[PDB]
Amino acid sequence: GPISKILVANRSEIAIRVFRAANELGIKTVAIWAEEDKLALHRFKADESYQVGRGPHLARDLGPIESYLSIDEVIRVAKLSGADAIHPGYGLLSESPEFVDACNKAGIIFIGPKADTMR
Amino acid sequence: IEKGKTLVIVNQAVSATDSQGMVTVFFELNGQPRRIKVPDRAHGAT
Ligand SMILES: [Cl-]
Protein backbone atom coordinates (compact mmCIF):
# COMPACT_ATOMS: atom_id res chain seq x y z
CA GLY A 1 0.00 0.00 0.00
CA PRO A 2 1.77 3.18 -1.17
CA ILE A 3 2.12 5.98 1.36
CA SER A 4 -1.24 7.82 1.57
CA LYS A 5 -1.18 9.92 4.76
CA ILE A 6 1.84 11.31 6.62
CA LEU A 7 1.95 12.55 10.18
CA VAL A 8 4.84 14.91 10.89
CA ALA A 9 6.04 14.43 14.42
CA ASN A 10 7.51 17.91 14.66
CA ARG A 11 6.83 21.67 14.59
CA SER A 12 7.97 24.92 13.00
CA GLU A 13 9.88 25.18 9.78
CA ILE A 14 10.59 21.50 9.31
CA ALA A 15 6.94 20.41 9.86
CA ILE A 16 6.04 22.95 7.19
CA ARG A 17 8.74 21.79 4.84
CA VAL A 18 7.46 18.18 5.07
CA PHE A 19 3.82 19.22 4.60
CA ARG A 20 4.82 20.85 1.26
CA ALA A 21 6.57 17.74 -0.08
CA ALA A 22 3.79 15.35 0.94
CA ASN A 23 1.17 17.68 -0.47
CA GLU A 24 2.98 18.16 -3.83
CA LEU A 25 3.06 14.34 -4.07
CA GLY A 26 -0.72 13.97 -3.43
CA ILE A 27 -0.24 12.64 0.14
CA LYS A 28 -2.54 13.96 2.95
CA THR A 29 -0.92 15.44 6.08
CA VAL A 30 -1.45 15.47 9.83
CA ALA A 31 0.10 17.93 12.25
CA ILE A 32 0.47 17.69 15.98
CA TRP A 33 0.64 20.62 18.41
CA ALA A 34 1.11 21.07 22.11
CA GLU A 35 -1.20 23.62 23.87
CA GLU A 36 1.64 26.19 23.99
CA ASP A 37 1.71 25.97 20.13
CA LYS A 38 -2.12 26.29 19.82
CA LEU A 39 -1.43 29.51 17.81
CA ALA A 40 1.72 28.22 15.93
CA LEU A 41 1.68 28.54 12.11
CA HIS A 42 2.74 24.91 11.42
CA ARG A 43 -0.47 23.44 12.81
CA PHE A 44 -2.71 25.30 10.30
CA LYS A 45 -0.42 24.09 7.51
CA ALA A 46 -1.54 20.43 7.48
CA ASP A 47 -4.75 18.81 6.11
CA GLU A 48 -5.81 18.10 9.66
CA SER A 49 -4.13 18.47 13.06
CA TYR A 50 -4.36 17.29 16.66
CA GLN A 51 -3.28 18.24 20.08
CA VAL A 52 -0.62 16.31 22.02
CA GLY A 53 0.26 16.49 25.76
CA ARG A 54 -3.04 17.12 27.53
CA GLY A 55 -6.21 15.28 28.44
CA PRO A 56 -7.93 12.31 30.15
CA HIS A 57 -5.42 9.82 28.88
CA LEU A 58 -2.61 11.44 30.82
CA ALA A 59 -1.66 11.55 34.55
CA ARG A 60 -0.39 15.15 34.19
CA ASP A 61 -0.07 17.88 31.52
CA LEU A 62 3.02 17.31 29.45
CA GLY A 63 5.50 20.20 29.17
CA PRO A 64 5.65 22.24 25.91
CA ILE A 65 8.60 20.28 24.42
CA GLU A 66 7.93 17.02 26.28
CA SER A 67 4.60 16.90 24.38
CA TYR A 68 6.56 16.46 21.10
CA LEU A 69 8.98 14.01 22.80
CA SER A 70 6.18 11.53 23.84
CA ILE A 71 6.26 8.35 21.80
CA ASP A 72 2.77 7.33 23.05
CA GLU A 73 1.25 10.71 22.00
CA VAL A 74 2.64 10.58 18.48
CA ILE A 75 1.48 6.99 17.98
CA ARG A 76 -1.89 7.78 19.56
CA VAL A 77 -2.27 10.58 16.95
CA ALA A 78 -1.15 8.47 13.96
CA LYS A 79 -3.93 5.99 14.93
CA LEU A 80 -6.63 8.57 15.69
CA SER A 81 -5.83 10.24 12.37
CA GLY A 82 -5.33 7.03 10.39
CA ALA A 83 -1.82 8.03 9.28
CA ASP A 84 0.21 5.29 7.50
CA ALA A 85 3.66 6.99 7.75
CA ILE A 86 5.34 9.37 10.18
CA HIS A 87 8.09 11.90 9.42
CA PRO A 88 10.10 12.77 12.56
CA GLY A 89 11.75 15.70 10.77
CA TYR A 90 14.84 16.61 12.73
CA GLY A 91 15.68 16.99 16.37
CA LEU A 92 13.07 15.55 18.70
CA LEU A 93 12.43 11.81 18.20
CA SER A 94 14.24 11.59 14.80
CA GLU A 95 17.16 9.70 16.31
CA SER A 96 15.23 7.48 18.72
CA PRO A 97 15.42 3.72 18.16
CA GLU A 98 12.63 3.27 20.80
CA PHE A 99 10.59 5.54 18.55
CA VAL A 100 11.41 3.57 15.40
CA ASP A 101 10.41 0.35 17.22
CA ALA A 102 7.09 1.80 18.40
CA CYS A 103 6.19 2.71 14.75
CA ASN A 104 7.10 -0.87 13.60
CA LYS A 105 5.01 -2.20 16.51
CA ALA A 106 1.92 -0.36 15.27
CA GLY A 107 2.55 -0.98 11.53
CA ILE A 108 3.33 2.67 10.74
CA ILE A 109 6.14 3.40 8.26
CA PHE A 110 8.97 5.28 9.94
CA ILE A 111 10.26 7.75 7.39
CA GLY A 112 13.88 7.21 8.25
CA PRO A 113 16.40 4.37 8.52
CA LYS A 114 15.87 1.14 10.49
CA ALA A 115 16.17 0.93 14.36
CA ASP A 116 19.44 -1.16 14.08
CA THR A 117 20.87 1.68 11.91
CA MET A 118 20.21 4.20 14.78
CA ARG A 119 21.87 2.03 17.43
CA ILE B 1 -15.29 22.89 13.17
CA GLU B 2 -14.38 19.33 12.04
CA LYS B 3 -12.28 16.40 13.24
CA GLY B 4 -8.80 17.91 13.16
CA LYS B 5 -9.70 21.56 12.40
CA THR B 6 -9.54 23.25 15.89
CA LEU B 7 -10.33 26.98 16.20
CA VAL B 8 -9.10 28.86 19.23
CA ILE B 9 -11.55 31.70 20.06
CA VAL B 10 -11.21 34.34 22.69
CA ASN B 11 -13.93 36.84 23.60
CA GLN B 12 -11.72 39.97 24.03
CA ALA B 13 -14.55 42.44 24.69
CA VAL B 14 -18.15 43.40 23.83
CA SER B 15 -18.96 46.98 22.98
CA ALA B 16 -21.72 49.09 24.51
CA THR B 17 -24.58 48.95 22.00
CA ASP B 18 -24.42 51.79 19.47
CA SER B 19 -27.10 53.66 17.74
CA GLN B 20 -28.63 51.85 14.89
CA GLY B 21 -28.49 49.52 17.93
CA MET B 22 -25.56 47.24 17.02
CA VAL B 23 -23.18 45.52 19.32
CA THR B 24 -19.71 44.52 18.20
CA VAL B 25 -17.95 41.59 19.88
CA PHE B 26 -14.21 41.61 19.60
CA PHE B 27 -12.81 38.11 19.17
CA GLU B 28 -9.45 36.64 18.71
CA LEU B 29 -9.66 33.68 16.25
CA ASN B 30 -6.46 31.63 16.15
CA GLY B 31 -4.53 34.68 17.34
CA GLN B 32 -6.13 37.11 14.89
CA PRO B 33 -8.60 39.90 15.81
CA ARG B 34 -12.13 39.67 14.39
CA ARG B 35 -15.06 42.01 15.03
CA ILE B 36 -18.61 40.73 14.64
CA LYS B 37 -21.71 42.93 14.70
CA VAL B 38 -25.04 41.70 16.01
CA PRO B 39 -28.39 43.45 16.69
CA ASP B 40 -29.13 44.03 20.36
CA ARG B 41 -32.62 42.35 20.30
CA ALA B 42 -32.43 42.12 24.11
CA HIS B 43 -33.12 45.80 24.87
CA GLY B 44 -35.36 46.56 21.89
CA ALA B 45 -32.85 47.08 19.08
CA THR B 46 -33.36 46.03 15.42
CL1 LIG C 1 9.04 20.59 28.66
mmCIF file of all heavy atoms in Angstrom, chain A residues 47-67, unseen atoms left out:
data_model
loop_
_atom_site.group_PDB
_atom_site.id
_atom_site.type_symbol
_atom_site.label_atom_id
_atom_site.label_comp_id
_atom_site.label_asym_id
_atom_site.label_seq_id
_atom_site.Cartn_x
_atom_site.Cartn_y
_atom_site.Cartn_z
ATOM 1 N N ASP A 47 -3.352 19.073 6.538
ATOM 2 C CA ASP A 47 -4.749 18.813 6.106
ATOM 3 C C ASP A 47 -5.642 18.664 7.332
ATOM 4 O O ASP A 47 -6.822 18.940 7.287
ATOM 5 C CB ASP A 47 -4.868 17.571 5.205
ATOM 6 C CG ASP A 47 -4.088 17.710 3.881
ATOM 7 O OD1 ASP A 47 -4.287 18.704 3.143
ATOM 8 O OD2 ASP A 47 -3.259 16.812 3.563
ATOM 9 N N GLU A 48 -5.056 18.248 8.445
ATOM 10 C CA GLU A 48 -5.812 18.100 9.662
ATOM 11 C C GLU A 48 -4.754 18.115 10.749
ATOM 12 O O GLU A 48 -3.599 17.936 10.436
ATOM 13 C CB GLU A 48 -6.650 16.787 9.614
ATOM 14 C CG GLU A 48 -5.880 15.516 9.217
ATOM 15 C CD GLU A 48 -6.739 14.248 9.211
ATOM 16 O OE1 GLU A 48 -7.753 14.199 9.939
ATOM 17 O OE2 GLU A 48 -6.410 13.291 8.480
ATOM 18 N N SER A 49 -5.124 18.348 12.005
ATOM 19 C CA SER A 49 -4.135 18.472 13.064
ATOM 20 C C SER A 49 -4.728 18.228 14.438
ATOM 21 O O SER A 49 -5.904 18.521 14.684
ATOM 22 C CB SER A 49 -3.494 19.889 12.992
ATOM 23 O OG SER A 49 -3.794 20.709 14.127
ATOM 24 N N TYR A 50 -3.891 17.735 15.356
ATOM 25 C CA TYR A 50 -4.356 17.286 16.661
ATOM 26 C C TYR A 50 -3.422 17.645 17.751
ATOM 27 O O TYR A 50 -2.163 17.661 17.556
ATOM 28 C CB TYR A 50 -4.503 15.766 16.662
ATOM 29 C CG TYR A 50 -5.429 15.314 15.578
ATOM 30 C CD1 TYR A 50 -4.961 15.066 14.278
ATOM 31 C CD2 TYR A 50 -6.798 15.177 15.843
ATOM 32 C CE1 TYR A 50 -5.840 14.687 13.262
ATOM 33 C CE2 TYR A 50 -7.680 14.795 14.848
ATOM 34 C CZ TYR A 50 -7.206 14.566 13.562
ATOM 35 O OH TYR A 50 -8.126 14.207 12.631
ATOM 36 N N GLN A 51 -4.019 17.856 18.919
ATOM 37 C CA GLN A 51 -3.280 18.240 20.076
ATOM 38 C C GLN A 51 -2.563 17.065 20.747
ATOM 39 O O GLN A 51 -3.164 16.038 20.968
ATOM 40 C CB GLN A 51 -4.189 18.971 21.058
ATOM 41 C CG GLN A 51 -3.427 19.508 22.242
ATOM 42 C CD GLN A 51 -4.326 20.247 23.232
ATOM 43 O OE1 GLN A 51 -5.478 20.557 22.923
ATOM 44 N NE2 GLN A 51 -3.807 20.516 24.425
ATOM 45 N N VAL A 52 -1.286 17.235 21.098
ATOM 46 C CA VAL A 52 -0.624 16.310 22.018
ATOM 47 C C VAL A 52 -0.295 16.908 23.383
ATOM 48 O O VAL A 52 -0.022 18.088 23.463
ATOM 49 C CB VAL A 52 0.649 15.736 21.402
ATOM 50 C CG1 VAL A 52 0.289 14.866 20.206
ATOM 51 C CG2 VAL A 52 1.718 16.820 21.051
ATOM 52 N N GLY A 53 -0.299 16.100 24.449
ATOM 53 C CA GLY A 53 0.256 16.491 25.764
ATOM 54 C C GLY A 53 -0.727 16.829 26.870
ATOM 55 O O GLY A 53 -0.349 17.000 28.056
ATOM 56 N N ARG A 54 -1.994 16.964 26.502
ATOM 57 C CA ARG A 54 -3.043 17.120 27.530
ATOM 58 C C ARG A 54 -4.284 16.307 27.311
ATOM 59 O O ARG A 54 -4.614 15.977 26.168
ATOM 60 C CB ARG A 54 -3.441 18.559 27.725
ATOM 61 C CG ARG A 54 -2.341 19.311 28.383
ATOM 62 C CD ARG A 54 -2.530 20.771 28.152
ATOM 63 N NE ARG A 54 -1.305 21.449 28.514
ATOM 64 C CZ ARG A 54 -1.294 22.593 29.186
ATOM 65 N NH1 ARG A 54 -2.446 23.162 29.573
ATOM 66 N NH2 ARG A 54 -0.146 23.165 29.474
ATOM 67 N N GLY A 55 -4.945 15.984 28.429
ATOM 68 C CA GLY A 55 -6.209 15.279 28.442
ATOM 69 C C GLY A 55 -6.317 14.051 29.358
ATOM 70 O O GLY A 55 -5.396 13.721 30.146
ATOM 71 N N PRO A 56 -7.456 13.342 29.226
ATOM 72 C CA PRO A 56 -7.934 12.314 30.146
ATOM 73 C C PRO A 56 -6.921 11.184 30.216
ATOM 74 O O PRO A 56 -6.728 10.552 31.259
ATOM 75 C CB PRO A 56 -9.226 11.804 29.462
ATOM 76 C CG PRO A 56 -9.545 12.760 28.360
ATOM 77 C CD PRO A 56 -8.217 13.344 27.959
ATOM 78 N N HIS A 57 -6.273 10.961 29.076
ATOM 79 C CA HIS A 57 -5.416 9.820 28.876
ATOM 80 C C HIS A 57 -4.094 9.996 29.560
ATOM 81 O O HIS A 57 -3.252 9.089 29.516
ATOM 82 C CB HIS A 57 -5.258 9.584 27.376
ATOM 83 C CG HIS A 57 -4.619 10.734 26.637
ATOM 84 N ND1 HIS A 57 -5.221 11.954 26.500
ATOM 85 C CD2 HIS A 57 -3.414 10.817 25.959
ATOM 86 C CE1 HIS A 57 -4.424 12.762 25.775
ATOM 87 N NE2 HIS A 57 -3.320 12.070 25.450
ATOM 88 N N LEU A 58 -3.890 11.160 30.190
ATOM 89 C CA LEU A 58 -2.608 11.437 30.822
ATOM 90 C C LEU A 58 -2.691 11.816 32.312
ATOM 91 O O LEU A 58 -3.579 12.576 32.727
ATOM 92 C CB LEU A 58 -1.837 12.496 30.033
ATOM 93 C CG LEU A 58 -1.448 12.284 28.555
ATOM 94 C CD1 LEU A 58 -0.931 13.599 27.977
ATOM 95 C CD2 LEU A 58 -0.391 11.194 28.356
ATOM 96 N N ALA A 59 -1.760 11.274 33.103
ATOM 97 C CA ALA A 59 -1.659 11.553 34.546
ATOM 98 C C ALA A 59 -1.455 13.039 34.876
ATOM 99 O O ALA A 59 -2.040 13.557 35.833
ATOM 100 C CB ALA A 59 -0.540 10.724 35.169
ATOM 101 N N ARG A 60 -0.611 13.701 34.090
ATOM 102 C CA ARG A 60 -0.390 15.148 34.189
ATOM 103 C C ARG A 60 -0.272 15.810 32.797
ATOM 104 O O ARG A 60 -0.151 15.115 31.784
ATOM 105 C CB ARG A 60 0.865 15.460 35.048
ATOM 106 C CG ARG A 60 2.161 14.765 34.635
ATOM 107 C CD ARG A 60 3.415 15.472 35.195
ATOM 108 N NE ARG A 60 4.646 14.864 34.674
ATOM 109 C CZ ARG A 60 5.303 15.269 33.590
ATOM 110 N NH1 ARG A 60 4.873 16.318 32.898
ATOM 111 N NH2 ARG A 60 6.400 14.628 33.190
ATOM 112 N N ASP A 61 -0.299 17.148 32.756
ATOM 113 C CA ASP A 61 -0.066 17.878 31.516
ATOM 114 C C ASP A 61 1.392 17.688 31.127
ATOM 115 O O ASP A 61 2.300 17.767 31.979
ATOM 116 C CB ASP A 61 -0.357 19.361 31.695
ATOM 117 C CG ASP A 61 -1.851 19.681 31.703
ATOM 118 O OD1 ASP A 61 -2.667 18.763 31.502
ATOM 119 O OD2 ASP A 61 -2.206 20.871 31.911
ATOM 120 N N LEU A 62 1.636 17.390 29.859
ATOM 121 C CA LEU A 62 3.022 17.305 29.445
ATOM 122 C C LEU A 62 3.577 18.716 29.179
ATOM 123 O O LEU A 62 2.829 19.628 28.801
ATOM 124 C CB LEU A 62 3.196 16.330 28.277
ATOM 125 C CG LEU A 62 2.998 14.831 28.604
ATOM 126 C CD1 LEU A 62 3.336 14.012 27.366
ATOM 127 C CD2 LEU A 62 3.797 14.352 29.824
ATOM 128 N N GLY A 63 4.873 18.907 29.408
ATOM 129 C CA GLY A 63 5.503 20.205 29.165
ATOM 130 C C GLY A 63 5.474 20.536 27.683
ATOM 131 O O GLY A 63 5.226 19.654 26.859
ATOM 132 N N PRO A 64 5.743 21.804 27.323
ATOM 133 C CA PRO A 64 5.654 22.239 25.911
ATOM 134 C C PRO A 64 6.490 21.430 24.921
ATOM 135 O O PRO A 64 6.046 21.223 23.782
ATOM 136 C CB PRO A 64 6.154 23.685 25.955
ATOM 137 C CG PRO A 64 6.863 23.808 27.280
ATOM 138 C CD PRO A 64 6.101 22.927 28.211
ATOM 139 N N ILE A 65 7.695 21.014 25.328
ATOM 140 C CA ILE A 65 8.600 20.277 24.421
ATOM 141 C C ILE A 65 8.383 18.764 24.596
ATOM 142 O O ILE A 65 8.358 17.973 23.625
ATOM 143 C CB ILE A 65 10.104 20.644 24.677
ATOM 144 C CG1 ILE A 65 10.503 22.019 24.097
ATOM 145 C CG2 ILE A 65 11.046 19.550 24.158
ATOM 146 N N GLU A 66 8.261 18.375 25.859
ATOM 147 C CA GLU A 66 7.928 17.021 26.281
ATOM 148 C C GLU A 66 6.726 16.508 25.498
ATOM 149 O O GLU A 66 6.633 15.343 25.255
ATOM 150 C CB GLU A 66 7.550 17.093 27.770
ATOM 151 C CG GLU A 66 7.686 15.814 28.558
ATOM 152 C CD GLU A 66 7.115 15.925 29.969
ATOM 153 O OE1 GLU A 66 6.737 17.042 30.374
ATOM 154 O OE2 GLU A 66 7.038 14.880 30.680
ATOM 155 N N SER A 67 5.788 17.375 25.105
ATOM 156 C CA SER A 67 4.603 16.898 24.375
ATOM 157 C C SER A 67 4.993 16.338 23.012
ATOM 158 O O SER A 67 4.340 15.440 22.506
ATOM 159 C CB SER A 67 3.514 17.985 24.248
ATOM 160 O OG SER A 67 2.981 18.392 25.523
#
